[PDB]
Write a protein that binds this ligand. Sequence first.
Ligand code: 9VG
Ligand code: 9VG
Lengths: 121, 121
Amino acid sequence: HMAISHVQLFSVPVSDQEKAKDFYVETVGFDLLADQPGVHGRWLQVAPKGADTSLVLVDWFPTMPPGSLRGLLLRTDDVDADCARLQERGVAVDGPKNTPWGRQAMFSDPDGNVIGLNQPS
Amino acid sequence: HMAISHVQLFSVPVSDQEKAKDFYVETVGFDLLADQPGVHGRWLQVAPKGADTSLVLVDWFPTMPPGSLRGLLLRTDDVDADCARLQERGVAVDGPKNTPWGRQAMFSDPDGNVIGLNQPS
Ligand SMILES: COC(=O)/C=C(\C)[C@@]12O[C@]13c1cc(O)c4c(c1N[C@H]2C#C/C=C\C#C[C@H]3O)C(=O)c1ccccc1C4=O
Ligand SMILES: COC(=O)/C=C(\C)[C@@]12O[C@]13c1cc(O)c4c(c1N[C@H]2C#C/C=C\C#C[C@H]3O)C(=O)c1ccccc1C4=O
């Protein structure tokens, strides 16, 4: 068996990092983990409070254009209240809808990356 | 404040899903969580054993061409041993090498998605 424990982090392609920081931290409610120099420029890292896996808001992978990400799903304990909060903050939300795999909604970040919310049935 | 607890899963763009399944499960040693019909085709879902955030090996999303993913970092308790295992199993590994954020290595999946390994200091 391998010694891998979990995904430490993955990357979300953004164009404007200040606008992405403000979206993920203020609108979506993530903690800011880091905002500091990195190897290809500004390293901006965010995550839900307490979570093992974080997100890096980067602009330096040509194969990942800003806004190209899909199929990112966030677990929430209250999808209905989260959707209402997003809507109050000016975000267009699709759903929530009951699905076979939980009650789910979708929304986009400022670049067009698509983010899902899922609350178990 | 938002009720989001963690990232449930994110998507990794692959072409041949059977090939991807065997690479992630047999070669990299991930647990197979699910392999069933999904909304837009075969749903194939893997994770390091016991991890909160999983990976979905999809060919659903035109904006994510197969093999385009970068900036994914897996946490491991023994990067040296994992690299030796990957090499034994017929995978090219770059590193491991010391960095400011831990001892890291990189390799690619059958489509060219780039996967990092990190053992913090
Ligand atoms: C070029 O080969 C790669 O694909 C390398 C990687 C995917 C990483 O080496 C890279 C990282 C660059 C950083 O600036 C990092 C880190 C890197 N690690 C790998 C990664 C990543 C996600 C985007 C990136 C990158 C690379 O420049 C990093 O792990 C950190 C961890 C904790 C705090 C800060 C950092 C960083 O600032
Ligand atoms: C930003 O992406 C989203 O908004 C994704 C969704 C709202 C998902 O509903 C989607 C899913 C489609 C499935 O086929 C799923 C599932 C979906 N849940 C969300 C997701 C995702 C990643 C790619 C996608 C998609 C959607 O069609 C799903 O959670 C499963 C859980 C356990 C076993 C099987 C499945 C599935 O087969």
